[PDB]
Amino acid sequence: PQSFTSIARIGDYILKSPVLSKLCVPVANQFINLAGYKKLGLKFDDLIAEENPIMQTALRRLPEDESYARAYRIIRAHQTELTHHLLPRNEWIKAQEDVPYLLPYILEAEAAAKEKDELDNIEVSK
Template sequence: MSFASGVALRRAVAARPWLHKIVVPIAEKYNDLAGYRKVGLVQDDLISDENEIVQEALKRLPPKVSYDRVYRLRRAVQCSLAHTILPKEEQTKPEADISYLMPYIEEVERERKEREELDSLTRAR
């Protein structure tokens, strides 16, 4: 699934209140069971950075946000190596699990789409 289709799915669910009431509790339970919050990560930390769009989005992050991301990832690796989880007070709370990278990814995708549209324009004769 591409980022654009994921965003479209998110918008479709948000636009339908009855579907939102069904999907959101299931998604929250899934996030709790996934375990990434127990090692201090947020959902956007799980996005693979092997994609050109994500690489560009990471370059656009403010220095503090970028530093926090690296810190969380290193702490999670340390927990993984030690086969431990963080104490409850250091685990990521659901309300703190906010998207910090997706706005930049969406911006890069919009710019690339706009660039492709401009590159494909032909001059009328």
């Protein structure tokens, strides 16, 4: 319940400002590698909860090969969490591989649902 347009607007306002980016991007990636979802072999777009119909739409949108890769990363994360270990350091998701791959599908589903709601509640230009 963050409505990805809103978080994208705040994040782009932080990134486009030089002072705010220089201040809280080191805090940002320090937060990321203290979060430790890399160490289970996951990406952050593999981590967004997908039990609402807009994210379910954005998972139908997704290409096939990225869907099979996402399915493998989920099953290796469940198996590694089951054994209570971590993946070895060669198998951790690196910083360059943590690509926001599912974000544009999510954002276009956001814009579609927002436009549907606006047009479902319009007045008339009298």
